[PDB]
Amino acid sequence: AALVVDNGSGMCKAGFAGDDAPRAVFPSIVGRPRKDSYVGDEAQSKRGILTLKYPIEHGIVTNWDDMEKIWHHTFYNELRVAPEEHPVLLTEAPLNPKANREKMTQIMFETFNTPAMYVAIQAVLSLYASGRTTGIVDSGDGVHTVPIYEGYALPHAILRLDLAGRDLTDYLMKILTERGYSFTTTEREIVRDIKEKLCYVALDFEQEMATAASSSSLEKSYELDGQVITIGNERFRCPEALFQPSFLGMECGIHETTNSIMKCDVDIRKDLYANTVLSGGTTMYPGIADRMQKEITALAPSTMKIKIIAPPERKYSVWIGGSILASLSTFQQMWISKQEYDESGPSIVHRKCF
Amino acid sequence: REIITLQLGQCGNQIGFEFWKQLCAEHGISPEGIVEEFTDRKDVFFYQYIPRAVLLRVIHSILNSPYAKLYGNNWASGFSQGEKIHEDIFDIIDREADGSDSLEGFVLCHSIAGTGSGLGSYLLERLNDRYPKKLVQTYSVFPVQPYNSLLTLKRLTQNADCVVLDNTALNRIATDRLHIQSFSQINQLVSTIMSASTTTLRYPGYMNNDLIGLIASLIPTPRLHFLMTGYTPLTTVLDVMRRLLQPKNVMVSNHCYIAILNIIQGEVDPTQVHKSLQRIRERKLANFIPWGPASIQVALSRKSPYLRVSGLMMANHTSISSLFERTCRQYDKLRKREDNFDEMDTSREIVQQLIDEYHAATRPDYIS
Numbered sequence: 276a277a278l279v280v281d282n283g284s285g286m287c288k289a290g291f292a293g294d295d296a297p298r299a300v301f302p303s304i305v306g307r308p309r310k311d312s313y314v315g316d317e318a319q320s321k322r323g324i325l326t327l328k329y330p331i332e333h334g335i336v337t338n339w340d341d342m343e344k345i346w347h348h349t350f351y352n353e354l355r356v357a358p359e360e361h362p363v364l365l366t367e368a369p370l371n372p373k374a375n376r377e378k379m380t381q382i383m384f385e386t387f388n389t390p391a392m393y394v395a396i397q398a399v400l401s402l403y404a405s406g407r408t409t410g411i412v413d414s415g416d417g418v419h420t421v422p423i424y425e426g427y428a429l430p431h432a433i434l435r436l437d438l439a440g441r442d443l444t445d446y447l448m449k450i451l452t453e454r455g456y457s458f459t460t461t462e463r464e465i466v467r468d469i470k471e472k473l474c475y476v477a478l479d480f481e482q483e484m485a486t487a488a489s490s491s492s493l494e495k496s497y498e499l500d501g502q503v504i505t506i507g508n509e510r511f512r513c514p515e516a517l518f519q520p521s522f523l524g525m526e527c528g529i530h531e532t533t534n535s536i537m538k539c540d541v542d543i544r545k546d547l548y549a550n551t552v553l554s555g556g557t558t559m560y561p562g563i564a565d566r567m568q569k570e571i572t573a574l575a576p577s578t579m580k581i582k583i584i585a586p587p588e589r590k591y592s593v594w595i596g597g598s599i600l601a602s603l604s605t606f607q608q609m610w611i612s613k614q615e616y617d618e619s620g621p622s623i624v625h626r627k628c629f
Numbered sequence: 630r631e632i633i634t635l636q637l638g639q640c641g642n643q644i645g646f647e648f649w650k651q652l653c654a655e656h657g658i659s660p661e662g663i664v665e666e667f668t669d670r671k672d673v674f675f676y677q678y679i680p681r682a683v684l685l686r687v688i689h690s691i692l693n694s695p696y697a698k699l700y701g702n703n704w705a706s707g708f709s710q711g712e713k714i715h716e717d718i719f720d721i722i723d724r725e726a727d728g729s730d731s732l733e734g735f736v737l738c739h740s741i742a743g744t745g746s747g748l749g750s751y752l753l754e755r756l757n758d759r760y761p762k763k764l765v766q767t768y769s770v771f772p773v774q775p776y777n778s779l780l781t782l783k784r785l786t787q788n789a790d791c792v793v794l795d796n797t798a799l800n801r802i803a804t805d806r807l808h809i810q811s812f813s814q815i816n817q818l819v820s821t822i823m824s825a826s827t828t829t830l831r832y833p834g835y836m837n838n839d840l841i842g843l844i845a846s847l848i849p850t851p852r853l854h855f856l857m858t859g860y861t862p863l864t865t866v867l868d869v870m871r872r873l874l875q876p877k878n879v880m881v882s883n884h885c886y887i888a889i890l891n892i893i894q895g896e897v898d899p900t901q902v903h904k905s906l907q908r909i910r911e912r913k914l915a916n917f918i919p920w921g922p923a924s925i926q927v928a929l930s931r932k933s934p935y936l937r938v939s940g941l942m943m944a945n946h947t948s949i950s951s952l953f954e955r956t957c958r959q960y961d962k963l964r965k966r967e968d969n970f971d972e973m974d975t976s977r978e979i980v981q982q983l984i985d986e987y988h989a990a991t992r993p994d995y996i997s
Contacts, residue, residue, distance in 0.1 A: 308934065309667040323666065 277362040279597040284334045285416025288594040292601035297594045299353040305341040314348035334368035334418040362391035364601045369419045377621035384616045391610040400596030401554035410550030414557035416440040420535040432538035440557040447513040476562040477511040514560045530570035552584045554592045630733035633681045638745020641738040647820040655933045661698040704777040707747015734764040741781045742772035750781045753788040764790045771795040775959040783976035798880040825941045828930045847888045847945045855949045859942035867905040869940040885916040887945040891927035895938030919993045950987035
């Protein structure tokens with residue numbers, strides 16, 4: 276079996292190629308005492324006696340020593356396999372520095388002795404999962420609008436937005452506190468749950484605010500120790516920040532950023548408009564697809580055909596796309612083999628994983 | 630059990646304040662007396678957290694420091710003023726003793742050199758009279774100066790139930806391996822010993838879990854209650870155990886030991902400890918009393934995770950009598966150079982008894 280490992284800024288997803296879903300998902304954290312190293316859920320569970328590190332906080336690996344520990348954890352603890360016995364497909368963020376790609380390659384072959392490996396861009400895998408090779412795609416925990424044509428991401432048109440799930444969770448804690456409650460402590464986990472369960476994207480912000488101000492029709496209850504609290508306009512005000520970052524003191528929203536299309540050759544822009552795919556946990560808010568449709572339509576030419584694709588399984592579309600790719604007959608010749616690595620070294624990744 | 634600490638004079642408050650600063654950091658307690666997030670027994674010294682301290686001009690320096698959220702020169706003047714406020718200062722201690730769960734002792738931090746010399750001698754007499762079952766351990770510090778030095782010695786030889794730290798050996802070690810040439814720099818060295826002296830009362834250990842356990846082991850006879858300290862790292866246990874017996878480290882300016890206690894605060898190997906003691910017996914680096922069977926004790930400990938191998942030595946050495954002769958001899962030279970003045974010779978009489986008591990302790994027939 277080939278392994279598929281999706282390296283996420285907040286959560287890593289791991290499993291076997293061919294499967295419909297990852298076998299394991301865990302926090303991208305490594306902790307050491309304030310057993311010497313803790314990784315994943317355990318690090319989170321015992322965070323009280325540990326100092327936590329986030330080696331891929333914004334999608335890009337910043338500490339390779341701890342990233343190596345996350346991968347060790349992935350193989351031996353989560354999947355219970357020996358990496359030297361299975362090819363490994365890894366995912367990377369859009370605009371990942373070339374040097375990082377070589378580092379990942381060297382670590383897999385030299386540290387884990389993988390028989391074969393490959394690295395693919397997250398957004399590209401999600402597009403594959405939707406059955407397309409062309410389109411524009413990703414909102415996760417700590418961080419993109421990625422135009423893709425014929426399977427190739429267009430780096431010049433890729434845009435990064437340092438606004439994602441983490442920021443939305445903290446913003447919800449802030450407005451719930453302003454409501455009269457008090458969510459300030461690492462309470463952050465509780466609010467993250469409230470966010471994932473009761474939030475939604477309003478089709479029209481002002482109208483929704485007016486409805487919530489004059490009635491209780493949009494209110495939902497949430498039970499903590501038994502205390503039941505009420506969440507009102509906070510339900511949609513929280514994700515509204517994706518469309519209006521100023522609510523967070525940030526100077527463009529996701530609809531406006533999806534600018535990426537305008538940076539592409541005019542001849543493929545219509546293909547992108549007609550194939551705008553959503554992926555990532557932060558795109559799971561109910562109502563987000565219709566809101567994007569409305570907002571993009573307002574920005575694009577009146578004669579443009581706009582279509583937003585929001586797969587029900589988009590939270591794991593990156594991993595699923597990797598499972599699909601690694602299972603393709605034509606992809607087998609694409610793996611970087613240990614032989615090829617020994618022949619050309621780490622830099623082969625640029626040619627093999629273009 | 631609990632221990633209430635008393636700080637007298639300028640020397641007491643500073644070395645006491647540096648003692649609490651070192652301990653508050655050892656534990657996960659922020660300077661504003663709030664536990665920080667980041668197993669160590671902290672109920673003996675801290676009251677659920679607030680230190681069980683009784684401080685007695687220098688107070689303003691403590692109140693202006695970031696640690697505000699944590700609470701003449703004649704010996705006769707020091708003894709007189711304590712008599713006038715007897716009920717006042719004894720009202721803050723009574724509630725401090727009563728309010729306590731089950732009081733155990735009265736740690737005292739003072740220097741015998743002006744008001745802490747007298748007011749210290751006064752409280753030492755009242756304490757024993759008020760409570761006869763409470764241990765009084767005094768971290769005295771050695772320096773009209775010869776007079777006040779021996780007067781408190783009269784009180785410290787019958788009242789105090791148990792540690793000398795002499796500034797002369799503090800100055801020598803300062804200039805030797807620390808290169809100071811300062812009060813604020815020597816205090817960093819004494820507080821390192823104090824926080825290490827009670828390292829067996831802040832962590833649940835196998836033995837020495839009570840203050841009466843550290844005392845009754847060393848002190849064989851209630852008159853011979855003066856101890857000295859040794860602290861090497863300023864590696865195996867044999868290296869530490871050998872470096873502690875070097876007179877270059879003993880903080881004291883025939884002769885033999887009565888009992889030694891070694892404190893190892895590291896992660897050392899627990900089986901090699903008996904191997905080191907065996908080689909100590911062969912090379913014969915230490916000599917003991919000939920009359921009674923005396924042994925050496927070594928105890929391990931665990932350093933706080935929030936706050937390497939160290940080592941401290943607590944021993945009851947007969948050479949401590951030499952320090953008293955220096956104080957005794959200087960007095961007689963002043964007695965010929967200038968209401969009744971009879972309190973001095975009584976003190977002079979009783980201190981000479983201890984000196985002869987020491988010199989007779991190193992004989993094969995010390996009994997009777």
